[PDB]
Design a binder for this molecule. Sequence first.
Ligand SMILES: CC(C)(C)OC(=O)NC[C@@H](Cc1cnc2ccccc2c1)c1cc(F)ccc1F
Ligand SMILES: [Zn+2]
Length: 955
Amino acid sequence: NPAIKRIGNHITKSPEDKREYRGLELANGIKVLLISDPTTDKSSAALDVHIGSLSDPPNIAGLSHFLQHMLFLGTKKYPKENEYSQFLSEHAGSSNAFTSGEHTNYYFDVSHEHLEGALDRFAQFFLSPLFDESAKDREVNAVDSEHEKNVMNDAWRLFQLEKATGNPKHPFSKFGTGNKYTLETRPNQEGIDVRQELLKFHSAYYSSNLMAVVVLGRESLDDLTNLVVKLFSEVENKNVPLPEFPEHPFQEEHLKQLYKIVPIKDIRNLYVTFPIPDLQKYYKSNPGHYLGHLIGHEGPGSLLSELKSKGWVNTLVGGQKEGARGFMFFIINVDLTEEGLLHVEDIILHMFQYIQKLRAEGPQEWVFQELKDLNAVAFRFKDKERPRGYTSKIAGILHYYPLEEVLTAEYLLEEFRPDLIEMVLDKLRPENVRVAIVSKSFEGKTDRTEEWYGTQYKQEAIPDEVIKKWQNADLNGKFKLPTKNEFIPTNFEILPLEKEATPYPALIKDTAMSKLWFKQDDKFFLPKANLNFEFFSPFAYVDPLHSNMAYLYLELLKDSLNEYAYAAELAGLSYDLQNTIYGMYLSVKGYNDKQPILLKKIIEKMATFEIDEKRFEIIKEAYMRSLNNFRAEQPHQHAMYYLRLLMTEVAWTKDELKEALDDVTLPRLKAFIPQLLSRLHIEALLHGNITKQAALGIMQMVEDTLIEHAHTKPLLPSQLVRYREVQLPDRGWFVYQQRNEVHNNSGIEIYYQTDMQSTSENMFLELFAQIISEPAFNTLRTKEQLGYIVFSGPRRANGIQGLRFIIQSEKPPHYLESRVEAFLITMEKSIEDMTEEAFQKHIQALAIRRLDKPKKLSAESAKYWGEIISQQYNFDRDNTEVAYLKTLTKEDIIKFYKEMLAVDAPRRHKVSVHVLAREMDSLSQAPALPQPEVIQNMTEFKRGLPLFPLVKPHI
Ligand SMILES: CC(C)(C)OC(=O)NC[C@@H](Cc1cnc2ccccc2c1)c1cc(F)ccc1F
Ligand SMILES: [Zn+2]
């Protein structure tokens, strides 16, 4: 009672939110939000310290970040460093943390029973941390792994490069991540004891007055109140003033500047940026959001629509962008066609024409009202969140908003402020602009290099004559304000649960044309529904050409519908449409109210679609580059790709796809579409706020619309063929090797094929994966430091399964091979030793994870959709498999390992894909390994092997 400075009033929440909330401020300055949820499976807490990278000392880049790794390694009360991770591990929890420019955010979840035990261990790091010196070298090699990861990633490159072109004296120029150089090599050379500087930064910065704590649990508001007072009232208050960065990092000499940048992927982008004051304080009227909505609009009369008609760009992003406390940015970013790259000046002229139009028209209240209405709807009917993300998010926002507004924060707009809009719009002018062009056409034409990532670039002043041209922009008649959004939902009725409602989806239609699975939502009760459709056609993947045409068809369909569908997206109604190895996939999600109207427009357009030649050529070129850009993908990404190609009956390569792409002409595509839609089978899942009858009426409308416009007829059952997995021979080991030409890291996937999926085989494999899961990370990543990516787990495809390992390392593939096999023996011993008690803990951990309950509709739909697309239809799977899992013995697992997985197992089926680093040449004891058969030709490999059956569906 005396340890609490004040209690907040009522925490404004949605009427639909049954969780209970209480805000308060501790006497030591800590802001608190408590969340009482008696139904939650997992409890969670989070602490956000309003200090991060921008506050690093200039001579030690990455220190805030480093302190984040170092802070959770042993305290006075809990000496052992593994304690926090261990306790969470033992009680179905997890933890994680992040460091930004102004924040360091620590969070965990745990089983609802063990909140106090977890929060106790958590609270100590903010009372008496030890920072065990033993780990220092490991945590530095960790931070170094992260940076090295991002080095070849174009987005991180652009992020840091922008920083390098501003005022070098401004904290905004800092390198926030750090690496081995900034945390070991340089501070050694300069005679810096990192540890005492770490400790110093902590002492100066980790003040309760800059801390926010969030706790979500089953316990009451009063019990949580007591617990948080008990644990956090002792955090020391050092009255640290909150860092402000009110000088803008781009000053007059950083303006009217042009940057020409070389990317890693063949991408072509234009970035237009305007320095603006910090708008955070105007949050109740949010004038940048207003301008972002309009400048970034995609409906008719939009900036984008005109840039698209002109053939200059495909996509556009607009609006306000965070900086830090004191400074912000307004951006207009576009991608560029080949013609766009030659008309950058004209593109920018058009941007200023639209900006000028918003001036001449002045502010519109009806637009603001629309935004207000949509945000109110969005807040009211917001999906429930996983507790871990929820607490972490709130902890951050506690630093920006009054207690009572912490949930409504990002949602609610109140007052229309025309003056403010006009103020922001006044900064959007040629004299305040910064321009960046990203293009490979600048390769070898650049004089500068960014130190952290190696990025190559050029800088030049924009000529005055250009600025003046932009300043003098006429009004353009192609630009118009949007009209009223007719997709705004108004019917939020939750339909009564039907008498014959089912717990799982039921087959409510089974015809030549369609299989329809349906479940009325009996859990979330929001006015939404998810409508998923799989369209099956043999002509979508028959050869590389057809697969190309499938892709382009749907890309052009989406491009054509975009103006119309954008309004619906703004109104919380969205769709996904993509091609598959079997046909097409369509998903429509969100508010059910106008859902049938959007669906019908899509099905109609699919069938009566008229192609724009100009768009066809542009989209085709963009797709070519997309196929090429896979070369720039990560090595482990490549490894996984190669293995799918290897193990699946039919699969066209990126090389085959691009080779066929030149044969896609407009007349060939126009012929393809009616052919594709001539014969179909549809399998659908309709899940949400809908009745059995409504479901049937939706399916009927989809069928009738295709039948009418495309003359669709059903496929033959014998035509509904799924692809099989390659059956590897007993005691075989095959290796496929390739090189990544971009990254100087290796990638590898090792796949131990087991058998066809079945209740028993599934649980043998999953328990084994459960057992080795933590050890694999601890040994291969933590101890041996093999690389950033270390993964093990079950692999499932085409009714078949096995065990896999994926690793990205500096070390050569064959080396990684011996270490994995070495690890596999370690676990062999380890299972023999392990106590019956420790074994049963593994079973319990697996069970809990498997029975994890979806917290939103989509997460429930996805589980159902999984069963539908695998054609196993096992909706009660979890319960059944857990029940079985519980009957398994330690022997069972030993037997299984010995028959299928052990180096000398009689039924070992091993396939490895090795992807070599850009430069690369073509401890527990590791066992002796046989000579692998090396795959030269994927077709030959496949021809020489049998193909598995397909799994019998659960009926
Ligand atoms: C958004 C991320 C990727 C984090 O990057 C940035 O914050 N800034 C880099 C920024 C792109 C950008 C712009 N102007 C520059 C001027 C000079 C030098 C580099 C620049 C980079 C960017 C903006 C954006 F909205 C989306 C992607 C982006 F890469
Ligand atoms: Zn890190």
